[PDB]
Amino acid sequence: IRTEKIICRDVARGYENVPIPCVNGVDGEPCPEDYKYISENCETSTMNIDRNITHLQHCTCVDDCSSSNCLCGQLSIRCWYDKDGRLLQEFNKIEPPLIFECNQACSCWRNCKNRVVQSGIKVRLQLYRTAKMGWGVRALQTIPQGTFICEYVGELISDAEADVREDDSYLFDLDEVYCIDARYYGNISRFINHLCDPNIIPVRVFMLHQDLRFPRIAFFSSRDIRTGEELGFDYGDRFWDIKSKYFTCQCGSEKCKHSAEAIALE
Amino acid sequence: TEKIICRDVARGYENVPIPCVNGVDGEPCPEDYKYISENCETSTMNIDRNITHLQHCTCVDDCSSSNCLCGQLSIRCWYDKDGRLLQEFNKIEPPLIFECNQACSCWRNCKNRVVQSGIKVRLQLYRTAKMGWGVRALQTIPQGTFICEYVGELISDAEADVREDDSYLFDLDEVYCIDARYYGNISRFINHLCDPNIIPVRVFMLHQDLRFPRIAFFSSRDIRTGEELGFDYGDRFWDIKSKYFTCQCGSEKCKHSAEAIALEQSRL
Ligand SMILES: C[S@@+](CC[C@H](N)C(=O)[O-])C[C@H]1O[C@@H](n2cnc3c(N)ncnc32)[C@H](O)[C@@H]1O
Ligand SMILES: C[S@@+](CC[C@H](N)C(=O)[O-])C[C@H]1O[C@@H](n2cnc3c(N)ncnc32)[C@H](O)[C@@H]1O
Ligand SMILES: [Zn+2]
Ligand SMILES: [Zn+2]
Ligand SMILES: [Zn+2]
Ligand SMILES: [Zn+2]
Ligand SMILES: [Zn+2]
Ligand SMILES: [Zn+2]
Numbered sequence: 445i446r447t448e449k450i451i452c453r454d455v456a457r458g459y460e461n462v463p464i465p466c467v468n469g470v471d472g473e474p475c476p477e478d479y480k481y482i483s484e485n486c487e488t489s490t491m492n493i494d495r496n497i498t499h500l501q502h503c504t505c506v507d508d509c510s511s512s513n514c515l516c517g518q519l520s521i522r523c524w525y526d527k528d529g530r531l532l533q534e535f536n537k538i539e540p541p542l543i544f545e546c547n548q549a550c551s552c553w554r555n556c557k558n559r560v561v562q563s564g565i566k567v568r569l570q571l572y573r574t575a576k577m578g579w580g581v582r583a584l585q586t587i588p589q590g591t592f593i594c595e596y597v598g599e600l601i602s603d604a605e606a607d608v609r610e611d612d613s614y615l616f617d618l619d620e621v622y623c624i625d626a627r628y629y630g631n632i633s634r635f636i637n638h639l640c641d642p643n644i645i646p647v648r649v650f651m652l653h654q655d656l657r658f659p660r661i662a663f664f665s666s667r668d669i670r671t672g673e674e675l676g677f678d679y680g681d682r683f684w685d686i687k688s689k690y691f692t693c694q695c696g697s698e699k700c701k702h703s704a705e706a707i708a709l710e
Numbered sequence: 711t712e713k714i715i716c717r718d719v720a721r722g723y724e725n726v727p728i729p730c731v732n733g734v735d736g737e738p739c740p741e742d743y744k745y746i747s748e749n750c751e752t753s754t755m756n757i758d759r760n761i762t763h764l765q766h767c768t769c770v771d772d773c774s775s776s777n778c779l780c781g782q783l784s785i786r787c788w789y790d791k792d793g794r795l796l797q798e799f800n801k802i803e804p805p806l807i808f809e810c811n812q813a814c815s816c817w818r819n820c821k822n823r824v825v826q827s828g829i830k831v832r833l834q835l836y837r838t839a840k841m842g843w844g845v846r847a848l849q850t851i852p853q854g855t856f857i858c859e860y861v862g863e864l865i866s867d868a869e870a871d872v873r874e875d876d877s878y879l880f881d882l883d884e885v886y887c888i889d890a891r892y893y894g895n896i897s898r899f900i901n902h903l904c905d906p907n908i909i910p911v912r913v914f915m916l917h918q919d920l921r922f923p924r925i926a927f928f929s930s931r932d933i934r935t936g937e938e939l940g941f942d943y944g945d946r947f948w949d950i951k952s953k954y955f956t957c958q959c960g961s962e963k964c965k966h967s968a969e970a971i972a973l974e975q976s977r978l
């Protein structure tokens with residue numbers, strides 16, 4: 445009988461607001477050290493991101509940015525965050541709008557109501573060894589629907605650079621066109637597995653800059669997540685049209701659209 | 711009577727609030743600039759952010775050993791266990807400090823990350839008797855304590871050479887400058903002292919682009935509660951401004967007062 449061992453107190457090395465421990469109760473695999481944990485996106489070549497402060501769209505708010513006069517919220521029709529920093533129930537979870545958070549050009553304070561993603565991880569997560577999908581990430585607490593979980597962080601690369609990379613299992617497309625590769629450099633999101641019935645959704649967010657070629661990817665719970673539940677987003681059709689050839693989906697859901705049994709039926 | 715006219719000039723952007731008071735005159739809270747906690751650009755600066763261009767260390771401890779690569783870049787790490795510059799630190803010609811970064815194998819709480827950890831002392835923007843607004847300590851501050859960074863708009867020497875208001879310029883001696891006139895933090899309000907209690911140190915943290923050192927002020931001696939902060943603006947500042955106004959620091963060591971200018975002119 446295998447018992448669960450704590451093999452890393454924090455894979456983030458103190459860079460997140462909270463520790464992200466690693467456990468393994470399935471096999472002898474030690475803490476993954478085949479990548480560089482980074483808390484924010486990195487560059488390995490000049491991306492020339494527009495960082496000009498005068499190019500920022502910003503609000504003239506003196507309040508906590510909870511009114512309809514907030515220009516930043518208007519950039520997505522309205523601010524989609526409630527008083528608790530959670531996405532509103534009517535938020536389009538299928539085709540989400542671009543979220544424009546407040547920034548350093550806004551007249552408002554750093555603790556206004558339009559600063560959720562820029563404030564970082566608040567929920568307790570754990571890197572753990574799954575039964576059939578290698579490493580995965582699970583909730584250490586109940587997470588209500590619309591809560592910010594974590595950012596998809598990695599190395600920013602061009603569409604051209606992504607097309608010459610051998611290991612394309614940690615790529616996130618920003619559909620100039622750029623990609624986030626978390627193979628060599630990434631955060632806790634590089635470990636999140638694919639679920640055909642996802643419990644998290646990717647949302648394009650803008651904070652310190654508003655260069656539309658480079659949205660930041662924020663994952664929000666798509667529904668209420670129970671304690672001990674594995675996190676999962678939909679990798680999309682590009683990932684599966686390339687990988688189904690080599691392996692099938694092991695999410696074990698009745699709604700599975702990429703398993704060997706799902707393949708045989710279609 | 712003293713009046714608290716702003717609870718936080720930084721609008722929650724620093725680790726601690728920086729209130730504004732005025733017990734001297736009717737001057738309202740300054741709003742003729744934009745408070746920013748980190749440097750900005752209003753043109754293409756192209757700061758080298760390439761993570762592979764970062765020199766970094768392989769420490770598995772708290773980077774308190776002489777074997778730390780980042781400390782060696784700085785000759786040695788100059789921070790003690792409490793994050794204060796060592797007594798033997800060169801305050802006249804300070805070395806370039808390379809703090810640890812996102813490429814080092816160490817943790818975010820290692821001993822080589824004082825400046826990137828931000829303001830920890832209680833500061834106050836206040837109205838002075840003779841020099842307009844100033845900044846003072848609301849606590850006693852031991853020698854070698856990190857105070858604040860000189861934050862502003864990054865501009866080239868070419869741009870600094872055509873800007874009209876040069877009263878908030880800090881030269882990074884391609885060369886570049888930090889202009890805190892339109893965009894700046896609490897440091898834009900620090901007055902000149904011929905006998906200063908703070909010193910600027912060039913520091914590298916998230917990038918190691920040598921055109922853009924970040925300017926960190928550290929106390930050059932023990933600072934008492936209520937004491938005004940001041941650094942030496944230097945000879946370029948006073949060689950230009952002495953014609954228009956003289957230094958009011960009041961020190962016996964003053965080199966830029968009407969009396970000091972009168973002595974210098976009769977000499978030359
Ligand atoms: C971004 S990585 C996720 C973390 C990965 N499990 C690890 O141990 O590094 C994606 C890879 O995990 C595995 N994986 C993720 N979701 C899966 C799924 N639904 N079914 C099967 N394998 C999956 C595949 O090996 C896939 O290429
Ligand atoms: C960077 S600003 C400092 C904050 C300024 N006192 C304010 O109220 O905005 C520098 C200017 O402050 C004044 N100043 C600073 N130190 C001074 C000194 N020792 N003597 C006289 N004026 C000084 C001069 O007007 C100088 O150009
Ligand atoms: Zn607003
Ligand atoms: Zn706001
Ligand atoms: Zn705003
Ligand atoms: Zn599936
Ligand atoms: Zn080190
Ligand atoms: Zn280091």
Ligand SMILES: [Zn+2]
Pocket residue numbers: 767769772773810811814816817820821822
């Ligand atoms: Zn270190």
Ligand SMILES: [Zn+2]
Pocket residue numbers: 903904957958959960961963964965966967
């Ligand atoms: Zn003086």
